[PDB]
Amino acid sequence: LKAFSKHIYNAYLKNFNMTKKKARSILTGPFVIHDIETLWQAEKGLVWLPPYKEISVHVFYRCQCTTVETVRELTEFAKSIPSFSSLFLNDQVTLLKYGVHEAIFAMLASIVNKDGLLVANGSGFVTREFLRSLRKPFSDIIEPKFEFAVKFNALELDDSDLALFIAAIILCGDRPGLMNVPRVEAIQDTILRALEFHLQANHPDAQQLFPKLLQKMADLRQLVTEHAQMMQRIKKTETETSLHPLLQEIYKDM
Amino acid sequence: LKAFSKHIYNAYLKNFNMTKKKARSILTPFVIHDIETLWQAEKGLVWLPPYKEISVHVFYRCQCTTVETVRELTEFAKSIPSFSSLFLNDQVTLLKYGVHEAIFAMLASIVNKDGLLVANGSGFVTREFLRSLRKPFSDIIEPKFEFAVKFNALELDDSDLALFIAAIILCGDRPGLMNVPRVEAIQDTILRALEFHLQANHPDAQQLFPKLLQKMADLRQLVTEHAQMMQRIKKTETETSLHPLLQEIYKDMY
Ligand SMILES: CCCc1c(OCCCOc2ccc(OCC(=O)O)cc2)ccc(C(C)=O)c1O
Ligand SMILES: CCCc1c(OCCCOc2ccc(OCC(=O)O)cc2)ccc(C(C)=O)c1O
């Protein structure tokens, strides 16, 4: 269990290009993108796909590049978890399908602060204000991740906690159309039971931390649901803006 | 390209326990041709739902072998050069619609005019006995023999088969494929690989390549017939269970 927990931690450290440790250090605990000018400045070099069109739509496409890229890292992370690799690829896909966004928003907390978040592997900092100035459609689907992040960061988890927490979110028996539910619920339980002992060791004086995170997991489920509805409104009202094919397959039935 | 072949041949040699050139040795095995011999193999030849009847029990043996071959193929495909780069969801699509095609192809390696090997060649079930099975199960089996016999006439070895098999999995025509161009390109290389490989390994033979491409189409018609028959069995043959995985593959075939 303590060994299983370390194993999950190593899979996390090996598969993610950005850990919270780094994130918090960079954010002192990076080019500031706060308007059209600075974002253009960032796109050229200081920092850094479909043809342009407008600021709000261009930032949405960056969210997509980022999320798809994180989905690739979550796939390798899960695959680096022996039990998960045992399931038939179909169940592996079902789990990733319904869990990556929940996992992405939990991890977004690592690179977020009351004022904004980092982008392009820590090189840039996009202000929450700027993101707020965007067109209503896009500005409102972004804001809630912040509200959840700030609150999430107050629990002060480290990469070791997050590794277990993220594995738990992915290995969930609830997901639509899962084939081997028992097997899955069993892997999660083992994960949760290891998180249980890990927190007691890592955060000795934090009371109620564990049941607090289970609630955070339920919270993430509601955050994604609302994210998905907003994603549906964008596919319906934003005729000119596209959506990466991989993201159309996830929101296919969500 | 010479390496590519050689690299797919090894992935085939370590992922598949039973190879044609091995099934050929132990065939130049306990003979199972009736209920008593099957009984003793099930006791002796230590290779499932409670014993129903002989016809159904043999049907369950097919599923068992079929489900385990899917396990192998999954690992094999994952060894194929660019296969693993494809997003999991496409990997699942390719496996879903290709595994039976692959399976019925490899089946030829262990097939005879008079029967086939089972449980790592320790057993051999006669074709006549399978033909003696109750009305529905006997009819879905026989056609694999008819196809296998003609296929063995091409006298291919394990090196050829490895490319032929990878070529069947990497098919850009499968319904619901996300990155079609990507798959089509990986398939082309496999084919050109198969192309040159056949030149060195079977210089004498004429029209072998066009022959094989036609075999791939035949295999496509074989599974369609197979899936229909399976659908009928899942309908009229109530009380006969179907492995959940096999249920996921067939659910969307017509
Ligand atoms: C995970 C995306 C992280 C992110 C931003 O997050 C905002 C909070 C998250 O907001 C969204 C997340 C995803 C999204 O759509 C894609 C999807 O839902 O899969 C839309 C909004 C905002 C800007 C950038 C830039 C400039 O590079 C960025 O990389
Ligand atoms: C590939 C299965 C190979 C096989 C047999 O093949 C008959 C030709 C293939 O026939 C079928 C293949 C699969 C099948 O259903 C399962 C599926 O469609 O996936 C039904 C018939 C017959 C008997 C056995 C035993 C006694 O162990 C066996 O392992």
Curated annotation (Swiss-Prot), chain B:
GO terms for cellular component: chromatin; nucleoplasm; nucleus. It is found in: Nucleus. One of its GO terms (molecular function) is lipid binding. The lineage of its organism: Eukaryota, Metazoa, Chordata, Craniata, Vertebrata. The keyword Transcription regulation applies. Residues 30-252 form the NR LBD domain. Heterodimer with the retinoid X receptor. Interacts (via domain NR LBD) with CRY1 and CRY2 in a ligand-dependent manner. Keywords: Activator, DNA-binding, Metal-binding, Nucleus, Receptor, Transcription, Transcription regulation, Ubl conjugation, Zinc, Zinc-finger. This is Peroxisome proliferator-activated receptor delta. 'Lys-48'-linked polyubiquitinated; leading to proteasomal degradation. Deubiquitinated and stabilized by OTUD3. GO terms for biological process: adipose tissue development; apoptotic process; apoptotic signaling pathway; axon ensheathment; cell differentiation; cell population proliferation; cell-substrate adhesion; cellular response to hypoxia. The chain holds residues 175 to 441 of 441 of the full protein. Ligand-activated transcription factor key mediator of energy metabolism in adipose tissues. Receptor that binds peroxisome proliferators such as hypolipidemic drugs and fatty acids. Has a preference for poly-unsaturated fatty acids, such as gamma-linoleic acid and eicosapentanoic acid. Once activated by a ligand, the receptor binds to promoter elements of target genes. Regulates the peroxisomal beta-oxidation pathway of fatty acids. Functions as transcription activator for the acyl-CoA oxidase gene. Decreases expression of NPC1L1 once activated by a ligand. The gene is PPARD.
